[PDB]
Every structure is written in structure tokens, then in C-alpha cells.
Amino acid sequence: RNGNLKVDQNGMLTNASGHLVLGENDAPITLPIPLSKIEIGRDGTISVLPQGAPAEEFQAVDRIKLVKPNDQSLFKDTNGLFRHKTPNQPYEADATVSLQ
Amino acid sequence: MHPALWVSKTGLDAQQTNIATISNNLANASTVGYKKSRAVFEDLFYQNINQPGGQSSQNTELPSGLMLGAGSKVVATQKVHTHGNAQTTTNALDMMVEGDGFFQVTLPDGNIGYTRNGQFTLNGEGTLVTSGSGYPVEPEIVIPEDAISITVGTDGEVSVRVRGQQDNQVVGQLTITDFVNPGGLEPIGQNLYLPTGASGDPQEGVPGLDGLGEIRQSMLEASNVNVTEELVNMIEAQRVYEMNSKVISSVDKMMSFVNQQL
Amino acid sequence: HPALWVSKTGLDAQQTNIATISNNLANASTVGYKKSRAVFEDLFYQNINQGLMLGAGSKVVATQKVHTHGNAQTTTNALDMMVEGDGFFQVTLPDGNIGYTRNGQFTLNGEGTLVTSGSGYPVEPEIVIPEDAISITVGTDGEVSVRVRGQQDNQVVGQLTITDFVNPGGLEPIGQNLYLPTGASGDPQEGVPGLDGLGEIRQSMLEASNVNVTEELVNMIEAQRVYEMNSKVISSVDKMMSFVNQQL
Amino acid sequence: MHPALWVSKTGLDAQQTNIATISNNLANASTVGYKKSRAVFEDLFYQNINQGLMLGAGSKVVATQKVHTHGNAQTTTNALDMMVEGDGFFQVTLPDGNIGYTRNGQFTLNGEGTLVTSGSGYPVEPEIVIPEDAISITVGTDGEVSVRVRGQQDNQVVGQLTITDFVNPGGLEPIGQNLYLPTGASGDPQEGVPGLDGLGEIRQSMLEASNVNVTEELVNMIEAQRVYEMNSKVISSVDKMMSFVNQQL
């Protein structure tokens, strides 16, 4: 639940804890390296502006994977991450979670 | 400390430059051949917190973004080079350009200075010089000691009348210089301008052809300042200046309250 | 303690609001300036102890440019002009793309091209004033003509065009009285200045700033008091937390 | 002790020096040929701990930058006070024998008629001596000093003033009395005719007013006072935190 996101030199989107942020393809989000303006929508959509592009060139490149499972079914692991109590269970991408 | 403090600081500095420009126009309300100036305001950069047109969620974009301004400043002082009124004088050595053009004088460093002031006179050698510092007028017009009257033609030809000789003798020819952008000249004081990069190439020729103005003898060009306009502008400049001080004072009390409370 | 940061949102919102108010008062003499109002909206609500709704505070979501036409200033300069209605002057930026302005204070460069009086950007389309011109006339439809001695009738040196946007509030201000087209601004609609909703070019006139100096002074009063009110909540919450740990 | 105590103390010291320059600017709001100064802030070194964690050490005022913008002109009826229209400093001879460079133009005559400063009376280099037979003093735009003598047509020349321009006027060392001393970073004294090769022109019966912005200084006092009080609250808060701990621990 730590949304202190950051972008490293390679363009990979992580948080302040160093964890890779997943995307819509279930893979870590890698943004174009030379950005000029990054906007996060109210649903996880990441829109970037290539450096030097006109203002009418904002394009969505990824969507942050947001999950709303049953809270009673989650346990905190040894590294502060909440995981399913039952192993080998995937994380469905819920479309109701909003980001402020 | 507070953004409103820095934003209103620019507004205070901008108005102070505006007032000084207004005061200079009123100071030169009797200067012959003075062109009034107007301060040009422009806003500073806007901080792009939220990009207008940025994609909000999906199938939706921000109709207007959170773009905070940084204040304003005076970016230019535009000289209004409109023709002034004519004053009739009995002197024969004060001239006026009837239209576009500038008289050319020789600065002490060697360069040619351009003036709209026509108050000229002679020096000990008879050369036509300015009535102030005494710079010679280009080209040199030497009035002979045998002259009984001076006539400066409309086409800039200077002639003198000599007793014992009909058909007054011509002693020289004056040439005036025009500029595409006379507002780009650099005012160096003493009613003199210097050519600059944006002033344009100095075009010289006879005063009355190729769009050049005509030389009017025994006439002076009064300043074009509007004394009523400067007084109204002083009212606007004073009030906007004070209302920016209100914002700074309010921020000062706001931070005083936070220090006492938090 | 949520009340600490709920009130901090109010302090941040007022700080942004006051900054925009100071920007309006700073540009009270800028030609062709459009005032702006900060848009407040409450943050999300949390359903706690689940049917109990608690707000998260407030924030400023956007700054809306009010593109209402300002008053008219009559000047004796022959190069400063005003758009009487809807439309923007288009200038060429050093990047090569076109910026759009409402400030009509223009002038000439060394070569005679019509340029802005500030940085000196050329005005699109290019208008070149010949050296033989003795007066410059700009018609109500952008028809620029000059007077030449020895020739009856003013010769035409070019025609200015203006651009209108469906949503001028969506333009991106970049300073220097300039705008950049964006996605939400719309498609730049050029054309003759005076037909099809476009405004008319008024030579020797300027468009004043549309800010209301009295309104901003009152807005300062209401912004300052709300800022102080949220400070007392933080102070009271601090006293409550300082009391609990001292007492216990 | 507690790092926050001394990090905040740097801010108190930094603002105190900042206020000292603002008061100096306001005090010299009527001095002829005074150049206002602003305090240049810079952050202290950042320490690396817990090893990618950077902690600042505070702030300090590293320099006092003088802004050598030309001030306005005061029209005076005195015939001995002058001004430099542009870049250039009047060169005066200090009692040590070295040359000090000034922009104040309020001059006068000594008992022997040499042009000196209106304050401590330091002579102006090169020496200009006004004869007793003179009835008027005229200083040309290029430093040419001439006097009008009765019974003799034409003003006789009694000297020519020269001015010195520095590539970095802000590198000069202020020593009071509107005087500067050349330093290593000032550059080399570039002396010549006052009006040729970038040098300004001498304007007689005119004075160069102070260039301080009294409105700016009052706003600068507002932010300096608030930041000074803001840093004091951290020290007060740290003091009550350390008092709580040893009372509790």
C-alpha cells in the first residue's frame, strides 16, 4: 500500500521500498527513458510525454496493477508484503480500486 | 517561504519599473523631440503541476490543468515614435524633420549619433553644432563669415545670402537618416540615439525622397507625451502597487499566526 | 492522527489558492491577461467502522482561466492591436512551432518583419514593412497596408490571420503572454480575422487585464481566515495528543 | 547532542547575516554611489549514514554579492560634484600611498586647490589644481577639466581626469568611505580616457544616487524574520523532546 513511486535510470517504475511495480501485462512497468511529464490517472493508467514532444502527444504506456481481494485472506510476510494465505493463488486485477 | 510572497514581489518590482517610466515621460514634458515610452508587461512561467489535456483515467482528459503562475514583470520599454507638434520660433538655426528621419551628429568617440532635436547653433569655426554639448552635425555645414542670412531648404540644402551677390551661395547639403525600427535605437541621453541590432541598417539620403522627412527651418518638434495619460497611469500604478503589498502583508500575518499556534 | 493531515490538506489548498490570487493581482496591468480561479474539491471518503463516512480533506484540482474579454485601451502607437472578440495572434517560437497570444503589443525588427515587443518572436504570417512606408494601416480584417509617397492608394504588404480555440481555458500558458495548443484546447481554427466567429483586429488599441482587483482583495480575506481556522485544528490536535501521553 | 539543534542553529546564523546585509542596504539608502548587496545562501555538506541516506548539515551565507547596477542621477547646482555615466571608478590616493577606487562623486577643493573628496579629503588621481584666478570650473564629458580666466579668451585646461573599470566590480573590497580596493578576483585596473573603450563619461554637477530597492528590502525583512522564527521553533521543539526523554527514560 506504499505508493511512493519512483523511476530509476533504466525507466523501471518502483516504490520507495525498492519493489518493482507490476503492470497490466503482469510484468514490471518500464517507462520510456527520456520522459518530460508523468501523469498517473485515477485508475492506475500511466501517461507519459516523450521529451521535446508537443503537449498533444500524451500517451498511455501502462496501467498499475491494482487488486482488491478479501482482506481476511491476506497475511503479512517477513518483508512487509501482504500475500494470500492459500499458496499458488493469483492476484486478480480489480477495476474498482482508485488512486488519488 | 510562501509562494504568494514571491509572486507579489514580482508585481511590486514590475510596478516600480512602470512608475519610473511614467515619471520619465512627465519629466520630459518640455524636451524638444522626445518620444514617450510605455512599459510592456508580461507574465512569468507557469508551473505545470497538472498538464492540461493530460489523460484522466480513460476516454477523458483534463479540460484545464493546475498551472500556477509565477507573477509578472516589465519586459520592454517601447518608444512611441509618433510625430510631435510644431513650435514656431524666430531662430534661423533650429530645424525640424517633417516626417521620418534623424539628424546625424558626430559623437566624441567618433561614432555617429542620431537626434530628433533640432536646436542647433554655430561654434567658433562656423560649423553647425548642437546647442547642448556642441557636437558637430554630419555633414559639416560651415557658415561663411560674409553671410547676412541663412536659408535651409526643404530638401536640406543650406544656402547663405551675401551682399554684392544675387542668387544666394550654397554652402552645403544636409542628409537625414531613417530607420525601419526607430524604437530599437538605444537612447544614450542628450537627445541622441545609437543604432543597434534590431534598429536596422541606417538609410541615408536627401531629406524628402525615399520616404525621408523634410527639413523645416525655424521650427521645433515638441514632445509627444500625453500629460493627462501619465497622471491616469500613475493612479493605476499606485493602486496595483498597493494591492500587492496587501497580499505580502496578509502572508506575513498568516505566518505569524502559524508560528504562534503550531 | 487523521485530523492532523485532514487540516494539512486545507492548509495546502488555501496556500495554492492564495498563490493564484497573488498572480491575478500581479498581472493587473498586463495587456491581454486572463484571470484564474482555483477549483476546490473534497478528497475521497472512507467508510469506517462498517456506514460512517469520513472525509480526507480538500485540494485544489485545477486553475481555470476565465477568458472574458477585457476593456479597451486607446494608444497612439500604430503597431499595437487588439482582437475585438474571440481569437489569438499566432507567433513563431524559436523551437519552430507556433505559439498563440492575446497581447497585441507588436513592433518591427531590423528587417521590417512584424515581431512581438518583448522577446521579438515573428508574427505568423510574416508581414514586412517596406522602408519607403510613411504610415502603416491594419484593417478590421487583418489587411495590412502601407502608404508610399508618389503612389496613390495604399499597397498591401500582407494579411494577418487569427486563431480561435473552442476551449481557451485548456491552453497551456508558457509565460510571455503565450499559449501552446494542447489536447483539451481543441483544434486551432485559423481564418480571416472577422468572419466565422473570429474577432476583429483593432489597430492602435490594447486589451486590458480582466482581473477584478476588488474581488481578489475579498478573496484574500476569505482565504486568510480559512487558513487560520485550519491551523487551530492542528494546534488543538497537538494539545490533545500532548495531553494524552502526559496524562497516561 | 541532537543534530537538529545545530542544523537549525545554522539557519539562525544564516538569516542573522542575511538581515545584517538588508539593514546595511536600508541604512545606505541615501548614500551617493552606493551599490546594494544580497546574501548568497548555500547548503552545507551532506553526510552519508546507515551503510544511500543523505542528511544535510544546515545552511550558511557563503558570499555577500554586490550588484553594480548604475543608479539614478541627482541634478545638483554644485560645480565640483560629478558622476560616471556608465562603467568606471574614480581613483583616489589613500594615505598609505595605494590607489583606492570610488564611485561617489562628491568632490571639493583643499587649501591648495587640489580636487579632493568631500569626506576625508583624499586627493583624486591624477591631481587637478584649480588656480585662484579661475572664475568657473568645467569638467568635460571625457574628463577634460578647464577653468575660465578673466582677461583671457578660451578656457585653459588644468588637467584631465581618468577613470578605471574592472572586469569584475563585485570582486572589489569595500573598506568604507565609499572606497574600494583591487583584489585578485577584481581583475586588472583598466584605465583610459573616460568615454572611450567601454569607459563611462563624466557628468558634471550630477550625483549617482543609491540603487537600493527600499521596497524589496522591506519584503526581504519579512521573509528573513519568519524563517528566523521558524528555525527557533525546531530548537524549542527539540529542547522539549530531550526534556521529555530524560524525564521519562
What HEC string does chain B produce? CCHHHHHHHHHHHHHHHHHHHHHHHHHCCCCCCCCCEEEEEEECCCEECCCCCCECCCCCECCCCCEECCCEEEEEEEECCCCCCEEECCCCCEEEEECCCEEEEECCCCCEEEECCCEEEECCCCEEEECCCCCEEECCCECCCCEEEEEECCCCEEEEEECCEEEEEEEEECCEEECCCHHHCEECCCCCEECCCCCCCCEEECECECCCCEEEECEEECCCCCHHHHHHHHHHHHHHHHHHHHHHHHHHHHHHHHHHHC
CB contact under 8 A, B54 and A43: no
Contact between C82 and C220 under an 8 Å Cβ cutoff? The reply is no
Technique that determined the structure = cryo-EM
Q: Which residue of A has its CA nearest to B65?
A: A39
B63 touches chain C (CB under 8 A): yes
**Packing angle, helices B3-27 and B227-261, rounded to 10:** 160
D222 touches chain B (CB under 8 A): yes
Vertex D23 angle, CA D22 and D27, to 5°: 120
Alpha-carbon span C191 to C90, nearest angstrom = 12
Asked if the C-beta of C99 comes within 8 angstroms of chain A's C-beta atoms, the answer is no
Residues 6 or more apart whose Cβ sits within 8 Å of residue A70: none
Q: Whose grid coordinates read 507625451? A: B225
| Closest to D156 (Cα-Cα) out of D141, D125, D140, D134 | D134
CB atoms within 10 A of CB A27: 11
Which residue, B241, C222, B235, is CA-closest to D218? B241
B6: nearest Cα among D220, D213, C36, C211 = D220
* Distance between CA atoms of residues C39 and D242, nearest Å: 43
List chain B residues with CB under 8 Å of A37.
Answer: 48, 51, 54
Amino acid at A73: S
Measure Cα distances from B174 to B11, B138, B208, C11 in Å.
48, 7, 11, 71
Does C148 contact B62 at a Cβ distance shorter than 8 Å? Answer: no
**Under 8 Å between Cβ of B44 and B69:** yes
Cβ neighbours of residue D248 closer than 8 Å, sequence gap 6 or more: none
Measured CA to CA, the distance from residue C139 to residue C202 in angstroms comes to 8
Q: Which of residues 98-117 of B touch C (CB under 8 A)?
A: 99-100
Q: Grid coordinates 519568519 are at which residue?
A: D226
Residues with Cβ within 8 Å of C96's Cβ and at least 6 positions away in sequence, in order, are: none
- CB-count burial class (<10 Å; 0-12, 13-18, 19+) for D105: buried
B78 is written with which cell numbers? 517601447
Q: Write down the residue that cell numbers 530531550 correspond to.
A: D242
The reply to whether B247 touches chain D by the CB within 8 Å rule is no
Cβ distance B127 to B171 under 8 Å? no
Please check whether residue C89 is in contact with residue C104, taking contact to mean a CB–CB distance below 8 angstroms. yes
Contacts of D51 (CB under 8 A, 6+ apart): none
Which residues in chain B have their CB less than 8 angstroms from residue C112's CB?
A: 180-181, 200
Taking a C-beta distance cutoff of 8 angstroms, is the pair D212, D29 a contact? yes
**Taking a C-beta distance cutoff of 8 angstroms, is the pair B158, B95 a contact?**
no
Which residues, in sequence order, are CB contacts of C147 under 8 Å at separation 6+? C133, C134, C135, C137, C154
Q: Residue D150: how many CA atoms within 13 Å on its side-chain side? A: 4
C 167-186 residues inside an 8 A Cβ radius of B: 167, 169-177, 182-185
Beta bridge partners of C101: C89, C178
Kind and range of the H or E element at C26?
A: helix C2-26
Provide the phi-psi class of D25: left if phi over 0, else alpha when psi is between -120 and 50, else beta: alpha
B5 close contact with D: CB closer than 8 A: yes
- Kindly determine whether residue C22 and residue B4, on different chains, have CB atoms separated by under 8 Å: yes
> Does the beta-carbon distance from B51 to A41 stay under 8 Å?
no
Three-state SS for chain D is CCHHHHHHHHHHHHHHHHHHHHHHHHHCCCCCCCCCEEEEEEECCCEEECCCEEECCCEEEEEEEECCCCCCEEECCCCCCEEEECECEEEEECCCCCEEEECCCCEEECCCCEEEECCCCCEECCCCECCCCEEEEEECCCCEEEEEECCCCCCEEEEECCEEECCCHHHCEECCCCCEECCCCCCCCEEECCCCCCECEEEECEEECCCCCHHHHHHHHHHHHHHHHHHHHHHHHHHHHHHHHHHHC
Say whether residue C172 is in contact with chain A using an 8 A CB cutoff: yes
Residue given cell 498538464 in the structure block: B51
Reading the block at residue C111, the C-alpha cell is 528587417
User: Cβ contacts (< 8 Å) between C173 and chain B: which residues?
Assistant: 43, 46, 67, 69
What angle is formed at CA B167 by the lines to CA B166 and CA B172, rounded to 5 degrees?
130
Q: How far apart are CA C88 and CA C166, in angstroms?
A: 12
Backbone angles phi, psi at D216, to 5 degrees: -65, -40
Contact residues, chain B, for A56 at CB < 8 Å: 53
Q: For the packed helices D214-248 and B227-261, what is the interaxial angle rounded to 10 degrees?
A: 10
Residue to substitute from A56, A71, A99, interface C, most C β-carbons within 10 A: A56
Query: Which chain B residues have a beta carbon less than 8 Å from that of C175?
Result: 42-46, 70
Q: Show the cell assigned to B214.
A: 523634410
CB contact under 8 A, B16 and D215: yes
Radius of gyration of chain A (CA): 15
Inter-residue contact B173 to C83 (CB < 8 Å) = no
Count other C-beta atoms under 10 Å from residue C32's C-beta: 25
Whether residue B109 contacts residue D195, with contact meaning beta carbons closer than 8 Å, is answered with yes
Q: Which residues of A84-99 are buried (b: 16+ CB within 10 A; e: fewer)?
A: eeeeeeeeebeeeeee
A48 → chain B, closest CA residue: B54
The answer to whether the beta carbons of residues C80 and C204 sit under 8 Å apart is yes
CB B227, CB D201: distance < 8 Å: no
Neighbours of A20 (CB within 10 A): 13
Taking the Cβ of residue B248 and every Cβ of chain D, the question of whether any pair is shorter than 8 Å is answered with yes
Shortest Cα distance, chain A CAs vs residue B56, angstroms: 5
Cβ within 8 Å, pair D229-B259: yes
Give the whole-angstrom CA distance, residue D234 versus residue D37.
29
Read off the amino acid at residue C103. Answer: N
Touching pair B, C by Cβ (3+ pairs < 8 Å): yes
Best CA proximity match to D22, nearest among D43, D42, D39: D39
Q: What are the φ/ψ torsions at residue B106 (nearest 5 degrees)?
A: -100, 110
- d(C-alpha C11, C-alpha C14), whole Å: 5
CB contacts < 8 A (A, C): 16
Place of cell 519512483: A6
3-state secondary structure of C245: helix
Cell of B187: 537612447
Give resolution, Å, one decimal.
3.2
DSSP-derived pairing of the beta strands B165-173 and B157-162 = antiparallel
Instruction: Tell how strand B72-79 and strand B37-43 pair up.
Output: antiparallel
| Most A CBs within 10 Å, among B57, B60, B61, B67, to test the A interface | B57
Q: Does B189 touch chain D (CB under 8 A)?
A: yes
- Identify the residue among C42, C165, C182 best suited for mutation to test binding to A, counting A beta carbons within 10 A and taking the highest: C182
Residue C185's nearest CA partner among C173, C168, C197 is C168
d(CA B133, CA C89): 45
Neighbouring chains to C with at least 3 Cβ pairs closer than 8 Å? A, B
Amino acid at B201: D
DSSP A23-81: -TTSSB-B--SSEEEEEE-TTSEEEEEETT--GGG-EEEEE-------GGGEEE-TTS-
Q: Is B133 in Cβ contact with D222 (below 8 Å)?
A: no
Quickly count: other Cβ atoms within 10 Å of residue B191's Cβ: 22
